[PDB]
Amino acid sequence: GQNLARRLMETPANEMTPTKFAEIVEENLKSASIKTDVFIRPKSWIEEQEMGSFLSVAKGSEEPPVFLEIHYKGSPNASEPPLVFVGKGITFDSGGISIKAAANMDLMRADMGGAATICSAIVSAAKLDLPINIVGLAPLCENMPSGKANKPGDVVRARNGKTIQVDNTDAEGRLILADALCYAHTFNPKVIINAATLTGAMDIALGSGATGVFTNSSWLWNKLFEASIETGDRVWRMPLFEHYTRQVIDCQLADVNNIGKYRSAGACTAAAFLKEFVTHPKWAHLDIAGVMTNKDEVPYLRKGMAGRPTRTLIEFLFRFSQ
């Protein structure tokens, strides 16, 4: 389940595009159980769904966006409310007009590691044939510079009606996730868990030793943390304080700005941006950017994309189902 994620992540973005990613997950989910349904929703659906914040990011590229929707119907009663997972699926993050430096931007092929991790865990929950209902949601697009890309300063409307000032085009995960997280409330979830290779600031923080989890639910914090002891693929809590909301809420043109005025608490400000799009009481945001890669730190993983934390996620679902 983890090695699927490592392969989804490691594959060069010109092979692991939005369509390709959805198609490999789709087949991997159906081989795991026929109690599944896949929807590789096209641009026209995303447009109909008024996901303008996600669409704003995908427009700079000629590679088509896909909104992947996975269902594993594992409960005896089909009407049991699901556990929903959301994941960032940028198949390559060049930054766009707020363009990235050349050095090591090849690792950005793994900026769909949020969508890889959660989708691999649904595939493994279904393989384990866990007695729960789970929806998997992943916006998939590339973030490229062009004559039609997002420009710094642009205001785009999220599905929920809020306007976002896109001050920095390299804060696109935030945007893709604004729309996918409003959509998760549609399913009437028990839990909303999103994952994302969101900020380099999480890497400066904990970055490497544990994935950061921002949650409004200490119950949910506790669940993920206990699964983490078991798998050994550690999780560490980070603050979801109003102080950070503030730095993202003061905004010139709009309701929310997609980046804070300061460098300080870079992963807490980006977490504050997502909460603006979440009304649910059991929500965890796992920022996976410091655990995207292995060099030598985790002994049993060779060098390259680590697929972290897919097993802590599978363990969480197992225990949640029992």
Partner: peptide, 4 residues
């Protein structure tokens, strides 16, 4: 991925 933004940087910091």
């Amino acid at each position: 991925x933004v940087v910091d």
